[PDB]
Amino acid sequence: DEINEPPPNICEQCLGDEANIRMTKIPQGSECKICTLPFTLYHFKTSKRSNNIIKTLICVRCATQRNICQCCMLDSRWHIPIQLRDHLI
Amino acid sequence: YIGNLITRQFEGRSNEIVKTTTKQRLDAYYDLELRNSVMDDILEMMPESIRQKKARTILQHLSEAWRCWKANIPWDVPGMPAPIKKIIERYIKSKADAWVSAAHYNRERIKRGAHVEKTMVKKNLGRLTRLWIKNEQERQRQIQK
Amino acid sequence: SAFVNKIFQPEVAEELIVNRYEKLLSQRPEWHAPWKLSRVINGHLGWVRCVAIDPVDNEWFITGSNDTTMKVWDLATGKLKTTLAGHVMTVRDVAVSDRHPYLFSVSEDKTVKCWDLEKNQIIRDYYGHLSGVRTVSIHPTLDLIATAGRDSVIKLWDMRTRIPVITLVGHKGPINQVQCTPVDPQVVSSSTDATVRLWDVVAGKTMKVLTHHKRSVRATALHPKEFSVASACTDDIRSWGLAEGSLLTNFESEKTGIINTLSINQDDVLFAGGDNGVLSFYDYKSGHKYQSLATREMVGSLEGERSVLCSTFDKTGLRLITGEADKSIKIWKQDETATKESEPGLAWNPNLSAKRF
Amino acid sequence: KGGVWTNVEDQILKAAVQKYGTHQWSKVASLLQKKTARQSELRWNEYLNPKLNFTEFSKEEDAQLLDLARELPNQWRTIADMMARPAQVCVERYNRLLESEDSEDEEKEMLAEARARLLNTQGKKATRKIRERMLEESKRIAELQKRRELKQAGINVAIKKPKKKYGTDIDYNEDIVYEQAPMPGIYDTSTEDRQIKKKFEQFERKVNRKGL
Amino acid sequence: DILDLEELREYQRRKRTEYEGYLKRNRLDMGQWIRYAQFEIEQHDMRRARSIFERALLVDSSFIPLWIRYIDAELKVKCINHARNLMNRAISTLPRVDKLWYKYLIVEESLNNVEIVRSLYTKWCSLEPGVNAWNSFVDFEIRQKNWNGVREIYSKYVMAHPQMQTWLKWVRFENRHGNTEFTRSVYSLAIDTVANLQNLQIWSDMEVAKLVNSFAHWEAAQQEYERSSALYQIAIEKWP
Amino acid sequence: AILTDQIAKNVKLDDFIPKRQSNFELSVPLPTKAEIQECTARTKSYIQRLVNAKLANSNNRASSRYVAPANLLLNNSHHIEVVSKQMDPLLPRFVGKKARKVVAPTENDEVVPVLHMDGGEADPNEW
Amino acid sequence: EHPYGKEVEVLMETKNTQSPQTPLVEPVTERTKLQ
Amino acid sequence: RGGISYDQLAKLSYEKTLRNLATQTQNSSKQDKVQKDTKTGKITIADDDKLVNKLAVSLQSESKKRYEARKRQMQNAKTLYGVESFINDKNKQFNEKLSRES
Amino acid sequence: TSHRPQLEARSGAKAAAYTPTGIEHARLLPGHTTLKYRK
Ligand SMILES: [Zn+2]
Ligand SMILES: [Zn+2]
């Protein structure tokens, strides 16, 4: 479905501390790092005066199947890497 | 035009190229639709236990019947089931109605001089000489009977 | 009776083989008047492969055929009105619009075409089927058409913009017949994988898969009242209840062999055209085959040519236009001055040997 | 120049018709030197067809032949379809029936060539494919032997992969491909997977020692 | 022959490229699917070997040799719980097919799980499949000596197939065991149901004659000739 | 009778039996006029939104002629304005869009029962 | 003589009875024009 | 005469393996549950590992026995008939297939 | 071999999962943009 798409999965610590964040949506932006298939690239900045753009690197389907955010690809709960998550379980 | 060229550079060409039917391949697409209709009607007459092997052999009696029609040879297979022989003769007569009517249509075009391909003049000659002898052989049998 | 329920004490009291059978004998099918041939129209150069009626005012019907040309025939007199050429292979299905002056026609040449009936010219061509297209259905009050064929998909076309809007991907074989209903399920399709699908067109997925037929489901037909579809395989015809997907009734079609077409009347008469030439009329609410006729081909033709290929009723329902493989168009009149007496039809006699019920 | 039919040319013509049918005679006559396609077509239809009956006529067939030859004088191809005999048989009998009122080595070479031609049914593309397949099998065996000999000398060199012909070409060894998992079932196949993993790891442990 | 694991790893790539090539050209040809699925069993990788049979079932799930071979592949490697899930999907997809039901049975027969074949047969005889299923279900309880259970089956079997060769099979059961009190109870139930359901017209004239005669010739062997004689009068009057 | 349900659950005897055989006069009603309108306006709006997706994404300039921000994230802990970037008319829009081919997996969660009837099965060698 | 038994009307049509430009549906012209 | 349908063939195959399981128990006798985890929903059946092994062995023995009964049929039918002209083995199997038609 | 009949046709199931290209065809250009409705 190209007209019904999920909202992106991003961490709280990627978004940071500020309340309102101006995020830019590009409907077929870059292609996913994992599945190499295009998606809606969301990118944003923590503050207005920051100097680092935080992009979503993977699509929401690869982010849901691993339960990770799209930006830093850490787990949505516990905020740990995937290799350490699957080792603790 | 150039917009189609540059997007074909950046993205490649599509993999869903469906070819429309043309004068070039209308004889090719006719037989694909003719073989599927014969393969459907026999598979529905079958009681059970027919696979990709038995559907493959029965379609060679369809090809053999049309070569017997063009030869004006009576197609009679000993041991052929009478429902299935009835199906093939229904579709050989159906293909013959297209084959003969295309020989009448293209003959009227060659007389008018109205853009007949050089291959089709040799093809329409080869059709009528089978139609002339088939009319000749039938006239011979009406005197003999 | 009550003896069966007290001795052979059931848990459902309907699912015994006798309690279902005693309710069929308790019920009598509706009488219907028999059918007779009234007109034979010989106008095509090949098989008549599809027939469509004028949905408004009922003056003409149109028969696409095997000689790549659609002819328009006047219903009353039987004369030929016009010929519509423009396909290069066999016209497989023809659908006339009730809300539009538009004629939709598919063929084996991979083309879906529209026709302005105020101009008799091809407008608004459709593109995208990988193989020959087999059926058209015009959606009531949505301005879509549904086309399907050998590609195992159903392309839902916007009329105005000519775009393949929705492709329905669930089948495994070539789709033989497709219907359009106003509510969900909006598309009913039948294919050679012995399935009838009920489609949710917004989600693009199947509501219900009807795997009750054994062989290729070659023909379906929508009932103009009472909101049901009937599908015909090579031996059985089954009426289906839409919005539940429920098997309504199982007809008395025994040794009819490949039903090629179906058409359902306002007066609950279902026609079943077979390849053997034997054409049979059923009670739609019961399944009782009350009449079985056979046709005469021509002066001279083959024995395979005796086969009904397509059929519709007219808007009044008192006429049946069938097109057959003998290049003919036969119109079947339901004869008046016949009563329940002296024309009873075949006797209502359900049996236990056939497990149909 | 017109040759006669020897028994070697007849049995090549029988074996060719049994190979090619009767509607391609320029392909039958290519096995036979000194015979045209028209000559081999006519020799079959007059002499070598097993449908033809070279039998003596009965007493009825003699009187029935004399009856036809007055009905159709003298139309011997038409009479021969009535008699279901060959036409030269019907004439030569009819003349005898009116006389009742009285008052190596070149052949062996072409036979070997025909025997080689009848028993080869493949074609260029099929034969070319067979040669190519044999070459590929030999190339693999050579490379494997080269790796075994270097393994005897201590140097370990890995097997090279076949290079990608296109961009999304698939290495089937790297990944289980379009894996379809068995549908989840109520029977809790948990210990079965442990035993199958243990047996599979045991198998691959035995391959690294015994070889296979 | 293969020496080490790297030569095996190059051997497995060459066959799997080959078989996946012919299956890409031919989605069909179920025999080609099984020969590649059998290849993966020989490589002892059952995770791959389950995948080809699953992919082949997505092409043609109505092909019965494909179901039996994948079931047998799970049984030969002793994965019994993988087979129970698989035969469950076999009978839930194709309930008509008798082979798939008998396959479930003779495996659970082989494991001496008598309560699972009994639960299987109760479901299978609920879908009204035909006389081959019931007759193998009454033969199952004779093996298990459950005489009270097999008598419950014929109570249901005559209601699923109302015909005298199912009723007379039940009196051939009872006269095999010689219980006189049970046999005439079945005989009384069989002749009343013909009378009770006379109007339905499902037993023919030759068919009801087998019930009256087998009732009478049994009563002749039970030395009660007056019951043998009187039933002939009620049957001739009841059916003239 | 230890596992009565867990065999062949998806298939029942009620799916085989017809419904009109118990009463021929069973009413299967046509869809009401208020019900056809609730489905028409849902379907027409879905397809018009699909046609507007195809006409906007096409690179023809003459297709605008023929034709959601402030979303919650992290259980609404962050209110996030979603904006669009002003695309360069000369750089290719949809940079991740290529003509590539994808094989799709099948989602088979429930088995569909192939509900044939039992079995007129005797046949000589005529076929 | 002719088949089907004289209740059935058999007709053989080889030519069109309308012009090709004849509209099969009459166009909806509500307002009358005098231009 | 005639052929045997698949529902009649499957019962006779089921009747035959019941006699193989009967004599297997008779040759053995001559010599001398259900747990349903509520959280997962899975059902575990505890059964004897001998009867599962004897199931796996007998399927392999029936697979090899039909493999050997067909291999000897391949070696016999190749060395029966050589009268009619052939070219390869696929021609011989086809010309023999024409003989069973008539 | 190499010259074969079709055992099955190419399905639209395969082309549905592909990514589109959006190439501009001359017969998909806008034309007859207004529908006519019957009285
Ligand atoms: Zn991804
Ligand atoms: Zn993150």
Short mmCIF file of C-alpha atoms in Angstrom, two decimals, chain C residues 8 18 352, chain E residues 131 135 154 157-173 186-197 202-215 239:
data_model
loop_
_atom_site.label_atom_id
_atom_site.label_comp_id
_atom_site.label_asym_id
_atom_site.label_seq_id
_atom_site.Cartn_x
_atom_site.Cartn_y
_atom_site.Cartn_z
CA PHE C 8 -31.42 -42.12 16.84
CA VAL C 18 -32.75 -38.51 6.53
CA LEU C 352 -30.25 -40.33 -1.57
CA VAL E 131 -18.42 -46.30 3.45
CA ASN E 135 -15.90 -49.85 7.67
CA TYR E 154 -23.29 -48.54 13.78
CA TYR E 157 -23.32 -45.45 10.51
CA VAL E 158 -26.91 -46.33 9.64
CA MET E 159 -27.81 -42.64 10.01
CA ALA E 160 -25.04 -41.58 7.61
CA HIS E 161 -25.67 -44.32 5.03
CA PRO E 162 -29.32 -45.41 5.29
CA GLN E 163 -29.33 -48.63 3.26
CA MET E 164 -29.68 -52.31 4.06
CA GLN E 165 -26.05 -53.29 3.47
CA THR E 166 -25.18 -51.04 6.42
CA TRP E 167 -28.04 -52.40 8.54
CA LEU E 168 -27.31 -56.02 7.57
CA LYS E 169 -23.62 -55.41 8.27
CA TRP E 170 -24.63 -54.51 11.82
CA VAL E 171 -26.61 -57.74 12.20
CA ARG E 172 -23.64 -59.66 10.77
CA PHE E 173 -21.69 -58.04 13.60
CA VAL E 186 -31.12 -54.22 16.04
CA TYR E 187 -33.62 -56.28 14.02
CA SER E 188 -36.50 -54.46 15.71
CA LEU E 189 -34.87 -51.09 14.99
CA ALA E 190 -34.19 -51.96 11.35
CA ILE E 191 -37.74 -53.02 10.47
CA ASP E 192 -39.43 -50.14 12.33
CA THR E 193 -37.33 -47.53 10.51
CA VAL E 194 -38.48 -48.95 7.17
CA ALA E 195 -42.06 -48.65 8.43
CA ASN E 196 -41.53 -45.24 10.11
CA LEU E 197 -39.83 -43.80 6.99
CA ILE E 202 -35.32 -44.69 -0.01
CA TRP E 203 -35.49 -48.50 0.26
CA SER E 204 -36.55 -50.44 -2.83
CA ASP E 205 -38.76 -53.54 -3.00
CA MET E 206 -35.80 -55.88 -3.46
CA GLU E 207 -34.00 -54.01 -0.68
CA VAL E 208 -36.71 -54.42 1.97
CA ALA E 209 -36.98 -58.12 1.08
CA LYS E 210 -33.44 -58.70 2.36
CA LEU E 211 -34.40 -57.30 5.77
CA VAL E 212 -37.59 -59.34 6.17
CA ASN E 213 -35.90 -62.57 5.08
CA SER E 214 -32.80 -62.10 7.24
CA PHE E 215 -35.10 -61.31 10.16
CA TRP E 239 -46.17 -53.49 1.90
#
